[PDB]
A paper describes a structure:
Porphyridium cruentum is a red marine microalga, reservoir of potentially high-added value molecules, such as carotenoids, sulfated exopolysaccharides (EPSs), B-phycoerythrin (PE), and lipids. Carotenoids are well-known antioxidants, also able to counteract many disorders, from type 2 diabetes, to degenerative diseases or cancer. PE, the main protein found inP. cruentum, has a good market value for different reasons: (i) in biomedical and molecular applications for its natural fluorescence; (ii) as a natural red-colored protein to be used as a dye for food and cosmetics, and (iii) in the pharmaceutical industry thanks to its antioxidant activity. The analyses revealed two major bands, whose molecular weights corresponded to α and β subunits (17 kDa) and γ subunit (30 kDa) of PE, in each lane.
To the best of our knowledge, this is the first time that PE was extracted and purified with such a purity grade by using only a single purification step. To determine the protein identity and purity, PE was crystallized, and its X-ray structure was determined at 1.60 Å resolution. The structure confirms the formation of the (αβ)3 hexamer but does not allow to identify the exact location of the γ subunit. The α subunit contains 164 residues, the β subunit 177 residues. Each αβ dimer has five PEBs in position α82, α139, β61, β82, and β158. The first PEB, which adopts two alternate conformations in our structure, is covalently attached to the side chain of Cys82 of the α subunit by ring A. The second PEB is bound to Cys139 of the same subunit. The other three PEBs are found in the β subunit. They are bound to the side chains of Cys61, Cys82, and Cys158. The UV–vis absorption spectrum showed a peculiar shoulder at 498 nm, ascribed to the phycourobilin chromophore of the γ subunit.
Author numbering:
A (entry chain CCC), B (entry chain AAA), C (entry chain AAA), D (entry chain CCC), E (entry chain AAA), F (entry chain CCC): 1 to 164
G (entry chain DDD), H (entry chain BBB), I (entry chain DDD), J (entry chain BBB), K (entry chain DDD), L (entry chain BBB): 1 to 177
Amino acid sequence: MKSVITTVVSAADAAGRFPSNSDLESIQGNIQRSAARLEAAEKLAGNHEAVVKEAGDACFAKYAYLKNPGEAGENQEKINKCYRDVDHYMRLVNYCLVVGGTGPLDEWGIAGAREVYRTLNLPTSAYVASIAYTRDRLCVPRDMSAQAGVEFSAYLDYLINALS
Amino acid sequence: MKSVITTVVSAADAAGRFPSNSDLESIQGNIQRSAARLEAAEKLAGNHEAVVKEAGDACFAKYAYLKNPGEAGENQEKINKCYRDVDHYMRLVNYCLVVGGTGPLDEWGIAGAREVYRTLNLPTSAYVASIAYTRDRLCVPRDMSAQAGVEFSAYLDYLINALS
Amino acid sequence: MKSVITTVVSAADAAGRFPSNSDLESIQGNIQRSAARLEAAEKLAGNHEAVVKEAGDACFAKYAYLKNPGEAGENQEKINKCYRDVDHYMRLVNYCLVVGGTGPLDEWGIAGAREVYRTLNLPTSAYVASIAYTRDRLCVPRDMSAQAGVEFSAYLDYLINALS
Amino acid sequence: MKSVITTVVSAADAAGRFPSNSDLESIQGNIQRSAARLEAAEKLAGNHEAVVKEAGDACFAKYAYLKNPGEAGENQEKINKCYRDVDHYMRLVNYCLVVGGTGPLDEWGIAGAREVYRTLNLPTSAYVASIAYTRDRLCVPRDMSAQAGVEFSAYLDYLINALS
Amino acid sequence: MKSVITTVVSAADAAGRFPSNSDLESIQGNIQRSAARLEAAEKLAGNHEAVVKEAGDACFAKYAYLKNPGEAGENQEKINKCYRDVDHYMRLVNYCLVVGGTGPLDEWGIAGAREVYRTLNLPTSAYVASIAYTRDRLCVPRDMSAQAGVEFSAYLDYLINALS
Amino acid sequence: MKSVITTVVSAADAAGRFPSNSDLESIQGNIQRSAARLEAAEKLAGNHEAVVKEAGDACFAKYAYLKNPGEAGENQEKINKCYRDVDHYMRLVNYCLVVGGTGPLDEWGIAGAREVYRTLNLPTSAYVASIAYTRDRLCVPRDMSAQAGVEFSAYLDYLINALS
Amino acid sequence: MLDAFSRVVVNSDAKAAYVGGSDLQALKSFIADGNKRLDAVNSIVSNASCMVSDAVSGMICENPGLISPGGNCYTNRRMAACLRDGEIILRYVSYALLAGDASVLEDRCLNGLKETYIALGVPTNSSIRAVSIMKAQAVAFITNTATERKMSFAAGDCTSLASEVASYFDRVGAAIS
Amino acid sequence: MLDAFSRVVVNSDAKAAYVGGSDLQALKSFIADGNKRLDAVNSIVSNASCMVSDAVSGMICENPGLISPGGNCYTNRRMAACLRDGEIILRYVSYALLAGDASVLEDRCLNGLKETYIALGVPTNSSIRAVSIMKAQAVAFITNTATERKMSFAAGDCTSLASEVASYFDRVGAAIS
Amino acid sequence: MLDAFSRVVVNSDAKAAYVGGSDLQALKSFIADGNKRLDAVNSIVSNASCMVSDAVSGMICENPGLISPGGNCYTNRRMAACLRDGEIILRYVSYALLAGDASVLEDRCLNGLKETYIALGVPTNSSIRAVSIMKAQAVAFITNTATERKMSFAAGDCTSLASEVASYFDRVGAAIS
Amino acid sequence: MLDAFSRVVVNSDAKAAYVGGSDLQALKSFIADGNKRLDAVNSIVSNASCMVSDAVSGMICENPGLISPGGNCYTNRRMAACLRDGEIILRYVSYALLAGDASVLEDRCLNGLKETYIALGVPTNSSIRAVSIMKAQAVAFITNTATERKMSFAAGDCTSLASEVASYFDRVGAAIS
Amino acid sequence: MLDAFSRVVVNSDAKAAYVGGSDLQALKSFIADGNKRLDAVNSIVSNASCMVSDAVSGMICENPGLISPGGNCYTNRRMAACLRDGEIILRYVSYALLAGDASVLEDRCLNGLKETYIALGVPTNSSIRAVSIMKAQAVAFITNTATERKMSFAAGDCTSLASEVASYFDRVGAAIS
Amino acid sequence: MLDAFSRVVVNSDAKAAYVGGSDLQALKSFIADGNKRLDAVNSIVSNASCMVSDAVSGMICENPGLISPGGNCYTNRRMAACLRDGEIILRYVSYALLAGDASVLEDRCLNGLKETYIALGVPTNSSIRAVSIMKAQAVAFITNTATERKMSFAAGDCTSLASEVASYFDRVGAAIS
């Protein structure tokens, strides 16, 4: 799982090294930045149901052609899986904010996603609409502090860039 | 040259990745810890002649045998090379404190040292005596702050362990 | 460039072999099947403007959203690039029918297409709509013989599966 | 076993490909050439005993020194193994004509043959005499059709070239 | 070129080693055994025309078939090349006796010989006949000392085994 | 175990070769040099206790600082292990003289020795003093013949060079 | 790998027998019906993407726990691996149908798959359902009885080819059970 | 590779000189401006897909010959390689900005790139135009003056960081010109 | 590998749960006490050479047959391998203490070690004594109760870190017994 | 590698042009003359051992210095390498004739052969003589006019196929001259 | 690998003992009789080709089913592999006789051979007959009692060397039974 | 690689000439002087660590700029590489003296060393001084005239062996000048 700690430990292990000063100094970075990302995680944890509804709503508002025959939101069951997926991604963003790294998105949401969405004919622009709507919906400091919003926004952009 | 920055950049490069949040968070540790190690670097830069004199003197005090014909310190020019070497190491400790990692010791001081000291019949115990005497001679808070002292000590201990 | 000939020559080369009976026998299939696919190639060469117009029109008919600001077909120059791309693909289908293999589609049409369409935000569903509409629009025996139609269909289906 | 089918399937498998048009077109070559090679196989199957006697006979007629002490046909048991070997090769030629490929000769008769004949001091010119006599004995269309004789002759030449 | 010296030097080099006692001790065997093999080399150098004449004559005596049209010795120029080849081999045996190893036979006589004799239809039995006749014709003590004869025989047997 | 025999056999095995003349010639070197090295081995076997006492004695005579606190001969138990080690090395020199090769020293005394002596802070100059004293103590032909002393001295120098 | 022709040759070689007229009536018929076999393989490879996605989607909609946490299609990484395996298995079955022999499927695909799935924790029972759905698809395409697509063929009967492709699909579940 | 700090150390070691208070003012300022540099790097990485897409599309709309036959972006394979090269260059420029030193860019990206592009027939002039568009985008994002997207920052001067990234982009064109 | 944070995320992912305030009090405390954890790791890595040589020397002085002929530390080659293994094990334990999770130690060091030592004839009972001596050393260094060295710390209590490093040492003997 | 057909496609793609009836007459003739091309290739491959043996022996009897000491065919090792090179060249010429295009020959055989022969001291002039003898043999076999062996063909004109193979042999001498 | 000398050293090292006069009478005799041992190895390696072909031919003429279909020497590929194995085994036996120790044969040839032959279906009983024929050949050559060849030796007795080479041949069947 | 004997063979093969009594006098003398050559090689290998240490230290005390910053022996890494190169050169010179031929030195050491040193910035002039000091040491040891150590030899003339080793050292400086 990519994090501050796993990066420096994996680098030490590649070189057969004990932890040294630059490794401790990196982890001091955790202590400093953690307050901001944990605030983002807690806010997301407490309000994900409402965030996810707005996100899925924006997707189907932008791309009404999804609800047509043979398309990806053609029945209520397929629409429900669309909201579930947006929830899945917001739960991985929550995890990224707790770990302090992209590892949860990387391993559990992005790896294989191009192959899956291509094979199941799920348009990536639909996912990007949901994620970008959430990114742009963010209101600071109404919804969280400035630097919690910087952390949250950074993972949302990371996911958009990974789908593009 | 191993530092906080080169470690996370090197890891990003091996995976073909842009910098991401754990990389930035690592480098924030740079910001937090820099005052302590630059304090130690400036003190060592300001007083290295005096530190080196004490360290070389401690070597020859412990190992009078070095001055015997055949031995590593048999004449005044060889003794002067010994104090030069201790100054070389203290200069690399200054560099490690500026970089915030072991890179300068590793590249310019430790790599090949075993081969060199073995081949030229320079006893590793003498070098350890000079470094250990300097670590033990450090006086907090007389010489520097506690956390400057931890940074200084860490690099002296790193070198001792590298020679052992 | 994958064809009957290059496949058996490439296999002979990897084993350091002269051509032998199975190689010659493979190429005899070339002789048998050529009339059907050159029939399909000449028909497509003779009428590609009309075929491409119908295919692009079918794309925009199915996905009116493409014409919306931000979308792939937001202005007339982008719409004209879309019909150009469909013509590019139909020209590679003509080439596959002349070569008697997927080489021209594989090398000049499919390799890198996933990266390109992902990066420029061109929905793969639109391209599939144009190709599928052309496959479904084929009229045997109005447009060509049954076996010309099988050859034409096979390359359109190959491209659809490559995009899916 | 090298054949039209195994060549194109092994090529598809190397590239992770489904069968495509050039592979089907190669196998259409089977359907076209099969009549000629199956006629050769059936004629050989029905008359191999008489073919093999003429072949072994020609070998010992050309190379009477084989029947001398310490040489390869020095007793009746060794002469009998010589005819058996010629039979073995004609049975592999029969198999090549059925498979439509050199695979049976390659795997069961040629691979290792240089090592065996060298170690057992069996002169390859003796085998070539038997095979070339059979090749040159062929009378078309007395013994088979023109293109059955082309198929038969091609495997006999393949074997001669493999021994030379 | 395989000899006592090149074997132990090559082994020292592969391990990055200076010569050591087993290497020097090996080369002392050089000193002990040299008289016997230089005796054999000088005898062969002194009388090679006579030896080669007997060896080629023995070839054609055993295999009169060689003189038949189509065969390896069908005309006088081909017969003269055969005696030349036997002289080439006896010259390489002289070299092996000077070097004290199989290097000259291995490099200049044996490597590629199987491919050459197979491709030009030169029966290996004829070459073995010439070499074997020479080994069997050796007369100790008429021609050389017992241990010169062992050295000479060893290289003739080495070549026979290389051709078998 | 490196010896004349294992060197030539390992070389033959690398090349898939039977033993040949240069290999037998190397082993004839054994027969020639064995008398000298076996005399050295027997003399060492019969007097190692007195040789080892002089050797350890010379080490502590040269390097009295060893008997100081925190140094390698600081108590009687550590001094006793020092003599034991010198005995270990003389027993491996005995083995080298019997095998006719460095293999026993290489495998059982040198491999890992730099790592062990570095980690346990045992100065290599102390071992070299013991070995060089023994080398220089040697009196020919009082203690052994000229060429037994050449063999003995060669292994002692081999060990000194391996520690330097 | 063997094809329908080299299979006969291997069986004949075991008896040191020449392949004669007596032996060739299956192979001459194999050749006679060869156009049907090319059509059958074309009908599969032309719809292979849809077959795999529909079959894996069907395995999941009947057993939704496969996409719950701890489920073996949970995460995009696992769903992609499963879709890849569906495509690999269909590709080897299509080679077996093109060659008229199971050896390429058994040798290159099925040999070691059971032990691998057990090691990875890939549910073999769910794998067998995915394969059974692809078997029903392929039988429909070969016999031009798919509900959602028709393709173009000369009038005749491909029931033997449909039975044969089914036998290759059945070997997958026999291997991994 | 070196960073802003090990660059100073390399310059000092050349004179066998300790790094002292005199020499550290730039480095103490580098540290004090550290949050801005982390923001600058975030502003680029957060928009990196759009930058590359837009920069390469831009190079093409200005020189539509690149996508004619015999053009170097003709075919999907070539276009994908070009977009890949735009992303690689932008990646190494972002490393250089994070490190405050060009060495990772010069050593791992630009070393031997001119020779590669020459061998491949990659037009170095068109490449430089793509890079100049990414320079224009990067300066706009660092200074929060992009026309189509603003991001969140405490107000302050980032002129130096914009000047520095522009200098890294300029090295690419310098290396392959 | 996992760290204290990704361990929590893995446990939450098994329940398809978001990590909320309810869940974060261990991790916020982990962060609060982070300076102590850095000091603990520093206290080990600063004395690692002495720890390994003293521990292996102690295993040998209690069981001198280890350095007799047929003994598994006999010859410099074997003593060097054993010292290397002591250093490797301590390095993996130090990573586990830095990360607040055993996964790097279990995955990269302990997985396959028992089977390896059995194959090589490395005595696991003597290995466990070496490790128990390093456990006592590390607990002394972390709590600044070593007899032969003191190091520099702000006043407080590291008993939880000492208990945690002991648990990582104990996993080594659990693996190889 | 390209064949007669993908060569036409490459030329057309250079003009973004469909291949139509105008362009196909050569290719329809290539197809109609296909059995003759299969016969031509059979006539060469069926005699390939004798061609190489005879061509290299020929180069030598005309220039007996090649087998003197310091000659490049002196020793069995050198002679075997030369016969190997004759067989390789003949193999790639036979591929070119099967394909109706020189690309496999130019790209996989002739690319860098001059530079190799230069480095090795392989006489390019003697090589060209060996190749000219194989050209003479190949034309004789394709036209069934070899003095020492006739093969079985339906009577017809193979002039074009003889001219083409001669053009492939001529490229070898062109590449290494 | 060990030789007669290093075998003694290994046995002495197990007792931490110096090799003294007491211990050396076998090795001094080994050296005294060394010329006989060189002659013995020469007598084998000079006839090795004939030994292997005669032994494999003998195994087959006593058990002709080995060359019937399904037989493990059927096909030239299998007969060549079997002849290769006969040569490999004889080469390792000759090394053991040159060194006066079985370790090279046991370590490099026999370790893993039984498991390999069982895996491949190589009949171990027939392998042991081939080896027993080579044992009889080698004993005849060493003692100059072969019927079809005499070689040249100083008068004396090599019965100990013949017994020793027999013991090395016997280890092959002990390994694979 | 060649030795004194295979060098004669290579010269003779160039004239297709047997080596006879005329040609063997040098080689019979090489054999008769063999014990001296083994002694010469022993005198160098037995002092090889001191030679390299002293030769490289010598190069430095005469040119102390080599260990200034930007010097090529500055840092432990560089000094270790230089001492390594001194030992490698001395190793290949000792092989040449053992063999009585320079080929192992020219082919495996000196081939491409000038180009390497040029690329690396290794000063070829300082290298030649190190090699000239090792030449001076080697001649002193072969002739037992070293000032600080004598070894044991039967008295005799080793002038030729000293001249030969000096000629090998001289080739190094010739190759990299």
